[PDB]
Amino acid sequence: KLLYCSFCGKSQHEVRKLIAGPSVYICDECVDLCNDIIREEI
Amino acid sequence: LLYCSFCGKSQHEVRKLIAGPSVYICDECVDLCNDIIREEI
Ligand SMILES: [Zn+2]
Ligand SMILES: [Zn+2]
Structure with missing residues (x-):
C-alpha cells in the first residue's frame, strides 16, 4: 500500500x-523543486 | 545514456x-506535472 x-x-x-x-x-514537493531548476529562479 | x-x-x-x-x-514531463497538480491546461 505504501x-x-x-x-x-x-x-x-x-x-x-x-x-x-x-x-x-x-511528489508535488519535488515538482516545486523542478520548477525552480527549470525556471532558474527561487 | x-x-x-x-x-x-x-x-x-x-x-x-x-x-x-x-x-x-525531463522538462516536458515537469510541465505535465504542473498541469496535473494545478488541474488546468
Ligand atoms: Zn518528492
Ligand atoms: Zn520526460
Whole structure:
C-alpha cells in the first residue's frame, strides 16, 4: 500500500500528490523543486 | 545514456533532465506535472 516519491522518498501519506510514471513517482514537493531548476529562479 | 524515467526521452532529446537518487525527469514531463497538480491546461 505504501508508495514512495522516487526523488525525496516520501510516501503518499506524506505529500499532497504523488504522480505516477512507468515504475516511478514524484511528489508535488519535488515538482516545486523542478520548477525552480527549470525556471532558474527561487 | 540517461533517459527521463517518465517519458523515456534521452538526455539528448530534451532541454533538461533532472536527476534523483536513481531516477530522472525531463522538462516536458515537469510541465505535465504542473498541469496535473494545478488541474488546468
Ligand atoms: Zn518528492
Ligand atoms: Zn520526460
